[PDB]
Nucleic acid binder design. Structure first.
Length: 91
RNA sequence: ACUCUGGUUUCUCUUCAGAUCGCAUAAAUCUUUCGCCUUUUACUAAAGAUUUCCGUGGAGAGGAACAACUCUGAGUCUUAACCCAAUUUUUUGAGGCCUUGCUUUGGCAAGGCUA
RNA sequence: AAGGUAAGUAU
């Protein structure tokens, strides 16, 4: 019993709609939306620590996002080989 | 050269963490010393004691993937051509006889005789 | 970031 990954277009659509809270269609359930918003600093911390390095053009990262698009987390720790990382930054 | 030994990867969970949990390094709270002082919320910078957070290790448990592929260790780790013996055993000249002591007798003990 | 709200009655 493991959660299968969703297509990247699913979260794209979820973010694209429900953008403004003024819509009254999804206002019925907001405790699930509001309760997951306190972890915004966690999303900030995970996002900035996975910032791409100057030698990298595009960095695809695993993403853990709320079912309503309330918050998105970068579920990845930037592990780097120390000699490789130091040599890359020296270059 | 024989036989048995039986993994690695990955995702969770539960606990234990001495150790540079971390060859890196944040914040909060409290109690003392200050610095600003005029009241909160911020602070100044040292010490002491906590808590949280970003991470970490070991062990245990439960799933998945490559489950079929081999390891290591142990087990006795198992074979013939031609060439060899003065220090321990298949080439090794080490034989016998007698004396006297002594043992209930057998024998034993020492010496002598060699070839 | 505050210690910088007049208290109102009408529409």
């Amino acid at each position: 019993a493991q959660k299968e990954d969703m297509p990247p277009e699913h979260v794209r659509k979820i973010i694209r709609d429900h953008g403004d809270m003024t819509n009254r269609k999804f206002r019925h359930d907001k405790r699930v939306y509001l309760g997951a918003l306190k972890y915004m600093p966690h999303a900030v911390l995970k996002l900035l620590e996975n910032m791409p390095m100057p030698w990298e053009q595009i960095r695809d990262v695993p993403v853990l996002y709320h079912i309503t698009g309330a918050i998105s987390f970068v579920n990845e720790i930037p592990w780097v080989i120390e000699p490789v990382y130091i040599s890359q930054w020296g270059s």
